[PDB]
Amino acid sequence: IPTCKITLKETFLTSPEELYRVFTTQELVQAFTHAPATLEADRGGKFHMVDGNVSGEFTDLVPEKHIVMKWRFKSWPEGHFATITLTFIDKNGETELCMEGRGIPAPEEERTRQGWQRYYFEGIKQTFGYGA
Ligand SMILES: CCc1oc2ccccc2c1C(=O)c1cc(Br)c(O)c(Br)c1
């Protein structure tokens, strides 16, 4: 499988604590995805979202600071996971979120960029009121 790396950065009008909670609380994920979610907020914990179209495992969870996860869309080759790193930086009580995605199937680059930039980032901002 040819793969690609993406890097996204986005600033949210909330604190790192509140943004980290949004990414790691099953009921908050259900809210901004408009779908049932299962999320085990533990190192080794599994997550399943959006009718199983997104799933994976958390591999590193440092509250308010970073999340590392194995992450996939359901249509990817079975057992193929991207590694997604989320880093939370306090900038004047706003949060600069840095997303790095490695191991994304190359044909799926634009779908995955849209998934993070539009669905996660704009969905979180619209659901919780964290700025434009
Ligand atoms: C990236 C997964 C995802 O993140 C969200 C955040 C807020 C609202 C919906 C979603 C959402 C989806 O439903 C979804 C489902 C499919 Br299938 C996709 O091909 C894409 Br792309 C996105």
Describe this protein's structure.
It is classed as structural protein. The entry lists the keywords Holdase, Activator of HSP90, structural protein. By secondary structure, the protein is of the alpha+beta class. Strands 1-7-6-5-4-3-2 form a seven-stranded antiparallel sheet, with helices on one face. The chain has one domain: START domain (Alpha-D-Glucose-1,6-Bisphosphate, Chain A, domain 4), CATH 3.30.530. It is built from three helices and seven strands, in the order E-H-H-E-E-E-E-E-E-H. Bound molecules: the ligand CCc1oc2ccccc2c1C(=O)c1cc(Br)c(O)c(Br)c1.
Short précis:
With 132 residues, the protein is an alpha+beta fold.
Descriptive labels:
Activator of 90 kDa heat shock protein ATPase homolog 1; Alpha-D-Glucose-1,6-Bisphosphate, Chain A, domain 4; monomeric; Activator of HSP90; globular; structural protein; alpha+beta; binds the ligand CCc1oc2ccccc2c1C(=O)c1cc(Br)c(O)c(Br)c1; 132 residues; seven-stranded antiparallel beta sheet; Holdase; 3 helices
Give me the number of helical elements: 3
What CATH architecture label applies? 2-Layer Sandwich
Order of helices and strands: EHHEEEEEEH
Catalogue the ligands.
ligand R75
| Helix/strand class | alpha+beta
Class in CATH?
Alpha Beta
Q: Give the N-terminus to C-terminus distance in angstroms.
A: 36 Å
Summarize the biggest pleated sheet.
Answer: 7 strands, antiparallel
Report Rg: 14 Å
| The CATH superfamily title | START domain
**Domain unit count:** 1
Number of strands: 7
User: Which range best describes the helical content: under 10%, 10-25%, 25-40%, 40-55%, 55-70% or over 70%?
Assistant: 25-40%
Which outline best applies? globular
